[PDB]
Assembly symmetry: D2
Homo-oligomer: 258 residues x 4
């Protein structure tokens, strides 16, 4: 579904970004990966070539919270491929866990700058190009914490709910051009962020924390990165031609459970 289509992925040097890069490459996509980690980008490109030896992959180091660097990764992508067909606005961090009264303004500002502002900046720059093209698909990475309350994550909760807001508002504005903007709300997916999250929950026994967290999930298991990549591939393809402004939870069913 992606033969010769250009997909831009932020946070493409690890986890969901990498898994999505691999899935899209398998479907024929041309890729532009963006991340602050050159080490991660190198590994993601290598992972991609293992699945698709002829895949064209561009890598760019950029901090999504910096507007100048956002313009930089967008320019790098268009100069290399000449267009942007898909955009996985995915970069993000968790933030240090703490109850609201102890979360701190510094940490709140940090999480908001990357998770929310970064997503806004990406949309501001990429949507202009897509409107001129008269086409384009976008997926913003929210979280179940973007539609429900997890606790001890003021910054993340505010930022991820904010991402859903950007998704709904932008979708209403650009849907008339054929552009589709949706968000995914991943739950407990075993990625580097989630592994570290469990480390925060119980530094002395992260394994116990992880096992305990998933007990209440209807599917009774953690999801894997490729399971998220499969949904993102759907939302960036022609198969989602009439899906717009939606939030798709990928959580085994927990957000719908009482």
């Amino acid at each position: 579904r992606f033969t010769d289509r250009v997909v831009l992925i932020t946070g493409g040097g690890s986890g969901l970004g990498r898994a999505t890069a691999v899935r899209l490459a398998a479907e024929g996509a041309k890729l532009s990966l963006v991340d602050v980690s050159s080490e991660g980008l190198e590994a993601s490109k290598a992972a991609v070539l293992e699945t698709a030896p002829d895949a064209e992959v561009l890598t760019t180091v950029a901090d999504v919270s910096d507007e100048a660097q956002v313009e930089a990764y967008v320019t790098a992508t268009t100069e290399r491929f000449g267009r942007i067909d898909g955009f996985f606005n995915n970069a993000g961090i968790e933030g240090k866990q703490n109850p609201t009264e102890s979360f701190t303004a510094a940490e709140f500002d940090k999480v908001v700058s990357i998770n929310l502002r970064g997503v806004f900046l990406g949309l501001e720059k990429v949507l202009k190009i897509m409107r001129e093209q008269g086409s384009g698909m976008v997926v913003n990475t929210a979280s179940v914490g973007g539609i429900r309350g997890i606790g001890n994550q003021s910054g993340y909760a505010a930022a991820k709910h904010g991402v859903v807001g950007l998704t709904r508002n932008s979708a209403v504005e650009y849907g008339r051009y054929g552009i589709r903007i949706n968000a995914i709300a991943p739950g407990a997916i075993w990625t580097p962020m989630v592994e570290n999250s469990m480390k925060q929950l119980d530094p002395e026994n992260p394994r116990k924390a992880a096992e305990e967290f998933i007990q209440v999930n209807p599917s009774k298991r953690y999801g894997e990165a490729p399971e998220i990549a499969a949904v993102v591939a759907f939302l960036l393809s022609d198969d989602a031609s009439y899906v717009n402004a939606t939030v798709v939870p990928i959580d085994g069913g927990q957000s719908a459970a009482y």
Copy 2:
């Protein structure tokens, strides 16, 4: 994604059911189509064979509001294919439009028996088979009227919201077996039901009614049947392996717009 996978579709003699049958067959599925209309079933099978000449298609005439007939189509399916990998619980009617005070108990009961009871009976019989298999994917057809208020459709609104309830409740029960149960919430899709709906809205000028209804939609256009089939194919495939108890609107973005 459906090579030799058996998919059972109710309401398979027209519209969304037919479009989904065609898309799934193109992906290699074996099909069991169910409908009250033998003539519609014949046309759907011919349509499937035009796209996939070697497709195996079973057809069964059955009224979903009758428990005996529901058991009959499920039995016909297992005797023919030996298993059920996917289930598109899609049959339904709109009901005669009227404000709540004039909707009538007769029409309310009619719509509920087909749109809600029919979906329940399907789940009751099929989920047993899927649990025994240790696998299965289910998609129940709700509507944007199942998550929002459209007006003048007491019966449809109650029944479709009910379908969402069955989806959420059953998903919480069967997710532990690897089974996934989700619902689609189609909006303005041009099918025979929507065409007839606009005729009810303004018998004197159905085209004017259709044009006026879609003016507020963010995508500025009606959706087409294949656009629904593409989403159903995703939700019935391995790509939706961690998606459960969700409702996916396919409405150009209108349910999310204020």
Copy 3:
């Protein structure tokens, strides 16, 4: 806020209905209580008179699943008071717990006839009267099971989600007259229904079942009937003059928690 105002309550012979009757009478309301239990209705009236000695209370025995009896209680109410200012469409049953494949059509039909059809019939008759008056407030009792999946309650989940649907659809139709129609979504409130529910969950140890069920609740406790009555009094008063088509969870925050 209810001096001289007439409020009609179904399921007024116990739990939430009785608690609401007491609260409304304390606020000066005239009452019309409806229930299948004559014993309950008389105990409710007695409870009302303890709080408001001069309260005017009418009691009518009626089964809400029977349209003729619904018309009977509405007529009894208008013949005695001459108008209906508020309507707490509250009667309901839980239904025998069982997974979807074992829920049975008989039990499904039973729960739907009382919880869903009963609410529809009440709206059909009462909304005509309120439209003619040019005023009126309605509260339909849904449940957290009407917005989330609890498990083992196909009938209840379908019917309560259906109640939310009736609420949204009817609210869109009658809002223009100044009429407001909203729904409440109670969670773990200790009433006779919840008491019996825990008995179903663990017959040998219902006390342990109740204890374990509430552990995950953010408020860490069960709600009490008067806490629901307070919200209903708000929704049936002039304070809710611009609140329409909403679902208000009264669950300590569990439906919002991941």
Copy 4:
């Protein structure tokens, strides 16, 4: 319901903040009003005293985006009253209307700093006091734009959705102490912010813009400030003792309408 109870209100110098101050004072509350406008505060206190001459009202000039000033208004409140029983975290601005690609990072940052960061800072300082007290009620002002997509308001949509996120996350954290945190989602309420919003929509004819905007609303009219104050009074009182982590739309029913 508020005899001698201390309620702190940000954005208390105008619109919803002022109307809420008046309603709460009528119910016996002691008030602490916070705003960047000294004239606004003076006018609000005068309005309160006209309704309740015996009310105790403290006013403090502070910019909610500045942490030092937030700590200052909280300290001013506790030194004057010794406690904080209710908190209406309400201050906010709209932001200049523009499609996403033209919204600008500067305007995005401005709206987020006041509407989102301001709400977080308020919760961080006040929830500590309420936890120590073992009691407290909080209402954060979101918007229909915090649960739906309005269009042309990237900053507002992101910030208000973020407010809903803080509401849910904090509510899950503090519900165990008996504290309740909820959000209101006002729609078209005729206040100074909305009047200015219509001027942005059509500078040439703001009246036409306003009339056109409300046409689709189910209630067929704009809401008034006292109608919001009535809901906030409910949410800050004992009547909402089991209501937590919810978002209550006060929009005539439009967010529920398709």
